[PDB]
């Protein structure tokens, strides 16, 4: 089975180097092209460039010339991409896709994506707080619960309820940047025969800081 893997996110200061990894498995890494796609939120998709892994020959867009650099390692079958002096406008989501050629060339498969955030802010562990009203006045037969995660950097973090046991009623909200910090408020809706019986927990993991926080409501 063909599967492409990329890291979740990477933090870099302006003026440093950015190194990304695209792992290929199930197909020959040589015979097939490796294409890169830049997705900036609100700007749509953008075409980075292509590279032929056998001869290292690269094809770069006119706008990304002299900036992006493509290279491949044929021993571990992993393609790399670098960016010289990334700036604030270079923050985006990067994909690596494979072209399966039958007549016209389309994108058959995609990667998970890596968020590159360029900011001078330090790595901060998150502060996670439970949210309960404390009393029920029988206003509804369904109970709303929430976890507030604030003061985390870099974005994103992965939030779940009881390690992903409740897949229904989950609502995860995106962050708003304030004071070089991020905040979110994850909410779930449980029935009334659950919360006096079971305890629903906030299970949040930040893979950039390697910090896993379990909080009880």
């Amino acid at each position: 089975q063909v599967q492409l893997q990329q890291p979740g996110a990477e933090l870099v200061r302006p003026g440093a180097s950015v190194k990304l990894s695209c792992k290929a498995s199930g197909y020959s890494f040589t015979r097939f092209w490796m294409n890169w796609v830049k997705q900036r939120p609100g700007q749509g998709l953008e075409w980075i460039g292509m590279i032929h892994p056998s001869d290292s020959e690269t094809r770069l867009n006119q706008k990304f010339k002299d900036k992006a650099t493509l290279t491949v390692d044929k021993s571990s079958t992993t393609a790399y991409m670098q960016l010289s002096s990334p700036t604030s406008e270079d923050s985006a989501v990067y994909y690596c896709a494979r072209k399966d050629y039958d007549y016209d060339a389309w994108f058959a498969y995609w990667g998970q994506g890596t968020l590159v955030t360029v900011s001078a802010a330090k790595t901060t562990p998150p502060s996670v707080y439970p949210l309960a009203p404390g009393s029920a006045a029988q206003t509804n037969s369904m109970v709303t619960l929430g976890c507030l995660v604030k003061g985390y950097f870099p974005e994103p973090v992965t939030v779940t309820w009881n390690s992903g046991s409740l897949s229904s009623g989950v609502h995860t909200f995106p962050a708003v940047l304030q004071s070089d910090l991020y905040t979110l408020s994850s909410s779930v809706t449980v029935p009334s025969s659950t919360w006096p019986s079971e305890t629903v927990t906030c299970n949040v993991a930040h893979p950039a800081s390697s910090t896993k926080v379990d909080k009880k409501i």
Binding site: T30, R31, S54, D55
Partner: peptide
């Protein structure tokens, strides 16, 4: 100058009967 090829594409007709 000369440009030596690298990969090799071999396409044969789809075989209905060997």
């Amino acid at each position: 100058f000369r440009v030596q090829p690298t990969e090799s594409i071999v396409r044969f007709p789809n075989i209905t009967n060997l």
